[PDB]
Design a protein around this ligand. Structure first.
Ligand SMILES: O=C(O)c1cccc(Cl)c1
Ligand SMILES: O=C(O)c1cccc(Cl)c1
Lengths: 498, 498
């Protein structure tokens, strides 16, 4: 195997004086060799204070050079970084750190208050006391490089109840990085300038962006806060070769580029990658018109990383397996060998090989639901297209079954989202009749505007949707309940309207 | 890990009906699924005759669809293919199979005579009795897929005394394939059409060409015999995306393309890769002028695969480490930690990690010479250029040390090779004076032509060579002694002229 530490160490010997970390705002550049020296020093200093290999340390911070040093430092020591979204509720973060029996918590968020008062006896480390603007506080004797095993825990990442802690083994690093090369077409070399738009607590942000950038002897451009015109200036200024970004980032970037034209020089950007299963046709449309570089749509999971992709995509929902990947579509709630007839819908399962998580920390029942007979079960519904591609339909959990028929809310949402006057829409099934579930649309109007059930129904009737998929009922709401992050709490919403 | 078998198996599930093997001459195409079925059937039939996992089977055959099936078949069974050059002497092949305690010998070469009469009780299998033109003789019950371990032997390849048997472990396959992607820029997908110019008994021919082609869900184009104009027609006809070829192939191909112009459509060819350390500046020159695609120079060994490379190269001798690679230049005949001053010459050693051989079969002394303290020693002399690239000078064994000075015969040979009237030249050191060794040139004239020591000396004097490097003596010969393959036996030649 080749671990994160080894990938980064080998890179440092090949390109010691090439720029590793760029923070254009803070006037901060760090070479590969200089990044190593700080990783070594924070490692040693963390060790000199009683942190041992395999001890889980929480990390809760926005993107920055300092948090990159600290995360790599912990891994170099041998500790297992558990990376957590800083948008989470103080209460949630304290609770997650408690369940995880975490030894320490590196924070740069008040949230420190919550952790002491949770019971969890996790040592609160403030990030600014380890490393500040790339320069660390040093002390302690230089430290040994611990022995690392293929199945051994290496990093913990969190999912979608409370977020679950997915354990990423040492051997998963390489293929979690190299798919950026086999699928996306990144290659080794110092031309690589990678814009860090993705948060570091998401596996793409860490393995596919941060680690890939350095492991290929390139440069990682730190972005502490996303602004669409500023990001495009970075593309031009830094000579960005690739960016991996959310559908929401790309909508912003494409529109800013459209209201920029040849004001910004974007030619250096050769790779625009995104997880676009949920990307509407209209955003995809603008991405091709207004942004340069080859576009690659990618499907993946925290649990197994990349499982499908598409070069120069037409719809955002249709993709095919790449290198490392093996996939099947099986009967919903059946065994891993129950393959559907091409054309019938089912659950996407992918083989659980090198890139796979090895279980959810302290949640062995959820693990047993997800890892069966060598497969990882996505909980996503899919269908083989006659053209040999996989069409992602939606989450199994969001699926509505009305009059014995599979209806996917995401399909209805993308239609209703184009209805004039609509700012947000979530489609849900209410426990009911026609039977089983009744398709119901919850719609938020644009600021100042009225909506009516009649007008929306007329709009749906005049759209491509088939009979049974048309909502039977509409609720016009001033907002939708959306947890600590900005994703809808369907269950909670269903509970609100009934 | 991801083994050859697993790489090819996963590929078959992703692209069952895409063309895997093309033999345009024989009118033979085989899809991925069809190639699998034959690999399964020859495997089973080989098993039904008493071949067990980990038993070494020799393979001695020119390139063909049938030998690809048989090699993959043996690996699928679990047997360890030992691939041998068919150009070797009958006596040599019998002897190598004897030392290797090989259980069987798959041959398609008389050479069968030699093997029985060597003592080695290796079962002689004729290739035409396993599979002919892609259709096998089937029998026996379908067979289990054996458990494979990371350090376990998988394939045996032979080197430069008698050729040594380098044992390639299961875990070496992935990085021996994926460097074609990280260094060379191959990516996953069915556009991949790979021309099989390289012999299958060379690690590049097997891992970097055959296995890479299939593992990326592409097509391998079988070439049973190299002809420069025919090969270029294949590029055009088959839509070849990449070729990996020897310097000798590229000289032929470039000249045929120059005496073709826009007669042949070569635009589909995006990657032209070669091991060009020994490629003269003039051939490289023509490669850029007359052949399309990005040119990539690559340095590597049987023992550790790829260790250096260069995109769009200027000299053929200057390269830098890519992904997976770590390299040092150390004092000749010193410890792995004795790094030279940048500018001093030394031995190129590369780290022995995932891609590395695990030893020479039954030759533990040679192993101990080559694998020290986690490094592989190339036996190649190199120097760091002020620009941070590695300049390969020549083999340590060919090095001449005259008047206490490092002189590399390859440098002198490339100068003398341009002297009009010269068809071949080898430079050697004779045990002698000035002192230690005396630089001596052995030159073969062109058909019908005379050479003189005086005229050659005049030519050298008028060349870029420094004082001490000029040959002190010339031998004009009608030929140079060149073993079973076409490489010069320096030791033997030295012995001839003295
Ligand atoms: O969260 C995702 O969409 C994701 C996660 C891992 C890998 C990929 Cl390609 C995508
Ligand atoms: O024999 C060579 O030159 C060789 C062997 C393995 C890998 C490479 Cl890139 C080159």
């Amino acid at each position: 195997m080749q671990t994160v530490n080894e990938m980064l160490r080998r890179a440092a010997t090949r390109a010691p004086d090439h720029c590793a970390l760029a923070v254009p705002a803070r006037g901060l550049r760090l070479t590969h060799a200089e990044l190593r020296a700080r990783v070594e020093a924070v490692a040693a200093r963390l060790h000199a204070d009683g942190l041992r290999p395999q001890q889980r340390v929480a990390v809760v911070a926005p993107n920055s050079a300092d948090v990159v040093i600290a995360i790599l430092a912990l891994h170099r020591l041998g500790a297992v970084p558990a990376l957590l979204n800083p948008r989470l509720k103080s209460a949630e973060l304290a609770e997650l750190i408690k369940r995880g029996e975490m030894t320490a918590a590196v924070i740069a968020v008040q949230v420190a208050d919550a952790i002491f008062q949770s019971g969890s006896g996790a040592r609160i480390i403030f990030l600014g006391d380890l490393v500040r603007d790339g320069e660390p506080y040093s002390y302690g004797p230089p430290i040994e490089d611990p022995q690392r095993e293929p199945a051994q825990p290496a990093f913990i990442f969190y999912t979608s109840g409370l977020p679950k802690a997915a354990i990423i083994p040492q051997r998963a690093a390489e293929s979690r990085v190299l798919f950026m090369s086999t699928q996306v077409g990144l290659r080794h070399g110092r031309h690589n300038v990678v814009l860090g738009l993705m948060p570091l607590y998401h596996v793409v942000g860490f393995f596919a962006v941060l680690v890939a950038a350095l492991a290929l002897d390139g440069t990682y451009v730190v972005v502490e806060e996303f602004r669409p015109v500023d990001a495009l200036q970075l593309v031009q200024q830094e000579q960005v070769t690739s960016l991996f970004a959310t559908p929401t980032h790309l909508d912003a970037l494409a529109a800013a580029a459209a209201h920029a034209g040849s004001s910004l020089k974007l030619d250096s950007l050769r790779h625009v990658t995104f997880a676009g299963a949920t990307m509407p046709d209209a955003v995809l449309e603008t991405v091709h018109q207004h942004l340069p570089g080859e576009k690659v749509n990618a499907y993946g999971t925290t649990e197994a990383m990349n499982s499908l992709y598409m070069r120069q995509p037409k719809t955002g929902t249709e993709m095919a397996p790449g290198f490392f990947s093996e996939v099947r579509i099986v009967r919903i709630g059946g065994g891993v060998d129950e393959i559907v007839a091409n054309g019938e819908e089912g659950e996407l399962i992918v083989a659980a090989s090198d890139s796979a998580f090895v279980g959810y920390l302290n949640q062995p029942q959820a693990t047993a639901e997800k890892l069966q007979d060598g497969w990882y079960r996505t909980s996503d519904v899919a269908v083989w297209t006659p053209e040999g591609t996989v069409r992602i339909l939606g989450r199994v959990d969001d699926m509505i079954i009305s009059g014995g028929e599979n209806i996917h809310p995401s399909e209805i949402e993308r239609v209703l989202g184009t209805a004039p006057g609509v700012t947000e829409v979530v489609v849900i099934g209410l426990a009911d009749q026609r039977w089983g579930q009744s398709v119901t649309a919850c719609v938020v109007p644009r600021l100042g505007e009225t909506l009516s059930a009649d007008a929306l129904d007329t709009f749906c009737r005049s759209s491509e949707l088939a009979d049974f998929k048309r909502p039977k009922r509409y609720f016009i709401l001033d907002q939708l309940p959306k947890n600590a992050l900005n994703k809808v709490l369907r269950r909670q919403l269903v509970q609100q309207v009934s």
